[PDB]
Design a binder for this molecule. Structure first.
Ligand SMILES: [Ca+2]
Ligand SMILES: [Ca+2]
Ligand SMILES: [Ca+2]
Ligand SMILES: [Ca+2]
Ligand SMILES: [Mg+2]
Ligand SMILES: [Mg+2]
Lengths: 382, 382
C-alpha cells in the first residue's frame, strides 16, 4: 500500500534476499526428531519457532544458508564426543536434504552463485548449507571434504566450544590465543577446496589472524557491530577494516543481546543502525543480513519471525539507503563472496595445489609390506 | 595376433568390462596412508598389489566398483569402534574421489548407467563406489543416505563381522539367523533410496531372505559357485535360482580359496568353469565378473593382476560362449541391475514412500517445549 512497501516488494522479486544463518533444521530435530513423514501441515504452520514454510513464503526470502548445527560434545571421553558429533552432523545434513527434496515447490538446493540464481528464477528459496563449528568434523579433513560434497558451503570455525583449530569468543580462558598451528593450515585447505570461511562465534584475535591469512573472502554469517554494542560475538572496527581488505561480508544478526544492553529493548531500528554503521564505514558492498532465526527464543520488535523481511527492506529504504545498496545488502554481496570463493578454489585446484591429509595409523607391519613387495616382483617375472 | 585375441580386444572396446570389486583404495591406505600428493610415478607403477593405473589401462577394463572397505571394529567399547569405522569410511571415500579427480584422463566418476556409458565413450574407466559392511554406517540410516550422496552405489550387508542388520558367512555362531528385524526394514530403505544390495560375505540364510524380500535386483559383487567348490562365501544352487527370480547378477570371484580345494591349484580355467556353470543354469544375463583384486595376496594362474582381463574374455570365447553372452558377462548385466535399482527407486520415491528414520534422543524437556509453544502463541497475537 505505501509507496515504500511497494518498492520493498519489487526489490524482493528483483533480487534474492539471502539470509546468512537459520537454525530451522535443529528445531526439526528438537520437535520432530528428524521424522517429517506426514508432518506437512505442521511444517507449513509450526507450533514452535520463528520459521515455517508458509511464513517463509510470506516474507519473500530469496535464499537461506540452513544451519546443520549440532551441540558441542559434552562426553567426558573426548574421542567419543567428537565422533558422536560427526554422526549427528550427518543426521542434520540428511534432514536438510529431505526437507528440500520433499518440498520442491518451495525449497531448491543450491551450492553456488549460479544455482542460487536458477533457484530464484524458478521462484524457490535457494537452500544452502553451513556447519557451525569444527567440532562437527571430528578432527578429520577427509570428513570436511566429504561435507563439502554433501553440500556444505560454509564452516563456522567454532561455536561456543574451543576446538583443535580455533578459539571461540564466549569461552575463557583462551586455548590457542587466536588460531592454532592446525587452524592456519586449515585456512589454506578451506580456500583450496572452495569452502567459505565463517568468522562468527570466533574470538577477536582469531578473526584478525584469519582475515590476514585467507586468500579468499570470508563472511560473518551472523554477527553485529562492537562499537554500537560491546559483545564478544560482535565485530570490532579493526576487524571490520580487515574484512574490507579481505573483500568479505558482515551479515548483521538479529540476536537481541548483540543489539542492546537490555535485550527487551532490541528493535528493527537497531538492526538498521548496525547495517548503516557498517555500510557507511566499509561500504554497502561488504554488509549482509544474518538473522540467526531459531537460534533464539524471541527476536527484536518488528523482526519476530521469517515473515518480517519486507519490513527490514522497507526500513533500509526509509532511512535513505539507495535501491542498489539495499540489493547489495539483501543478497548480491554474499553471492559475490561465494562466487569469489569458488573462483579462488578453481585457480588453486587448477594449479595443482596439494591438499591437507589426515594423520593416519600404520595398518601394515614390515612383514606384510615385505610379502607384498616380494609378491609384486614375482608378478614382474611372468 | 590370434583371431580370438583380436575378437577379445574388439569386445573390450565395444562394451565396458565392469568389475564388481577391487580393494585398491585400501592398498593406498596401507602403502601411502591416503597421501597421494607427488606419487603419480608409483600410482602408475605400484611397488605392491594387483592394481595400478598403467596395468589398469593395459587390461582394457571399462569400469570398476572401487571398494571403500574399512576393517570390522576391534575396540572392546563397541560404540567407539562403530563411530571410528564411520570416520574411516569417510577417509576411504575421500581418497577414492581424490584418486579419480587427480587422474581425469584415466578415471571418471560414475554413479548410474548413463554415467558409466559416457565415461566409457570418453575412454575412461567408469569409477563407481561400494562399501563393504553395514558396520561402516555406525548404525545410522541418515549416514547411509549421505553415503549414497557421496557416490556409494552398493552396500555389502556384512564383511567378516556380524552387524545389527545381517549375519556374515565366515563367523559362527549365528547372531540373527539370516536377517534381523532391522535388516528386513533396511532392505525396504535400500530399495527406496536406489542403493544396490550386495549379498557377498553374507550367510546362505541371509541371502535367501534378502532375495525373497528385495523389490529391486541385487548383486553378488564377488562370489563364486558352491556346487563346484563348497565354501561359506560361494552361492548355493538354491540362492542361484532365487537370484534368477530376483533378476540379479552373480559376479564371479577370482579368490583362490573359492575356486579350488588347494589354493595353489586355482587357475583362469576355474573362473571360466564357474561363469559357464552359472550361465548354463540361470542364463548368461545373470552372471558377471567380480575379481576381488587387492583383497588377496595372489591371484589364479592367468589372472595375476588387472592387466589379465583380455585373457578372461578370450577364454570365454574359446569355450563357446557367444559374443553377445560374453558382452553380458563383461558389463551389460551389472549395468542393467543398476538401471533397474534406479528405476525401482524413482517409482517408490515418485509414489512418496516414507523413508526409514534413526531413533534419536529427546534434546528438549517439557519446560523448553512449553516456552516455545507459549512464544509461538505470543507471535500469533501480533
Ligand atoms: Ca547459534
Ligand atoms: Ca533455543
Ligand atoms: Ca575383501
Ligand atoms: Ca591383503
Ligand atoms: Mg573501521
Ligand atoms: Mg539352480
Amino acid at each position: 500500500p505505501s509507496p515504500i512497501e511497494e518498492q520493498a516488494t519489487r526489490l524482493l522479486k528483483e533480487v534474492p534476499l539471502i539470509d546468512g544463518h537459520n537454525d530451522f533444521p535443529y528445531m526439526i530435530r528438537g520437535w520432530f526428531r528428524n521424522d517429517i513423514n506426514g508432518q506437512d501441515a505442521h511444517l507449513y504452520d509450526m507450533p514452535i519457532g520463528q520459521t515455517d514454510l508458509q511464513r517463509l513464503q510470506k516474507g519473500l526470502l530469496g535464499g537461506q544458508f540452513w544451519s546443520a548445527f549440532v551441540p558441542c560434545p559434552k562426553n567426558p571421553d573426548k574421542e567419543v564426543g567428537s565422533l558422536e558429533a560427526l554422526r549427528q552432523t550427518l543426521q542434520q545434513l540428511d534432514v536438510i536434504h529431505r526437507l528440500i527434496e520433499r518440498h520442491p515447490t518451495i525449497l531448491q538446493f543450491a551450492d553456488s552463485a549460479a544455482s542460487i540464481w536458477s533457484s530464484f528464477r524458478a521462484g524457490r528459496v535457494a537452500s544452502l548449507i553451513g556447519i557451525e563449528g569444527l567440532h562437527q568434523i571430528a578432527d578429520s579433513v577427509s570428513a570436511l571434504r566429504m561435507l563439502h560434497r554433501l553440500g556444505v558451503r560454509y564452516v563456522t570455525l567454532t561455536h561456543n566450544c574451543h576446538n583443535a583449530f580455533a578459539d571461540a569468543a564466549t569461552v575463557s580462558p583462551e586455548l590457542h590465543g587466536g588460531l592454532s598451528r592446525k587452524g592456519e593450515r586449515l585456512i589454506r585447505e578451506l580456500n583450496r577446496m572452495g569452502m567459505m570461511i565463517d568468522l562468527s562465534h570466533t574470538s577477536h584475535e582469531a578473526q584478525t589472524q584469519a582475515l590476514r591469512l585467507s586468500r579468499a573472502p570470508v563472511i560473518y554469517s551472523h554477527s553485529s557491530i562492537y562499537s554500537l554494542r560491546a559483545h564478544a560475538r560482535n565485530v570490532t572496527d579493526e576487524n571490520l577494516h580487515l574484512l574490507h581488505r579481505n573483500r568479505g561480508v558482515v551479515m548483521i544478526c538479529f540476536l537481541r543481546e548483540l543489539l542492546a544492553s537490555e535485550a527487551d529493548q532490541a528493535t528493527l531500528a537497531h538492526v538498521i543502525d548496525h547495517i548503516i554503521y557498517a555500510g557507511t564505514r566499509i561500504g554497502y558492498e561488504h554488509v549482509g543480513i544474518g538473522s540467526d532465526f531459531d537460534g533464539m527464543l524471541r527476536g527484536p520488535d518488528g523482526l519476530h519471525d521469517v515473515s518480517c523481511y519486507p519490513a527490514l527492506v522497507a526500513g533500509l529504504l526509509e532511512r535513505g539507503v539507495s535501491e542498489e545498496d539495499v540489493k547489495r545488502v539483501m543478497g548480491l554481496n554474499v553471492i559475490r563472496v561465494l562466487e569469489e570463493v569458488e573462483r579462488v578454489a578453481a585457480e588453486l585446484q587448477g594449479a595443482g595445489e596439494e591438499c591437507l591429509c589426515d594423520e593416519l595409523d600404520e595398518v601394515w607391519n614390515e612383514d606384510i609390506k615385505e610379502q607384498l613387495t616380494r609378491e609384486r616382483e614375482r608378478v614382474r617375472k611372468l
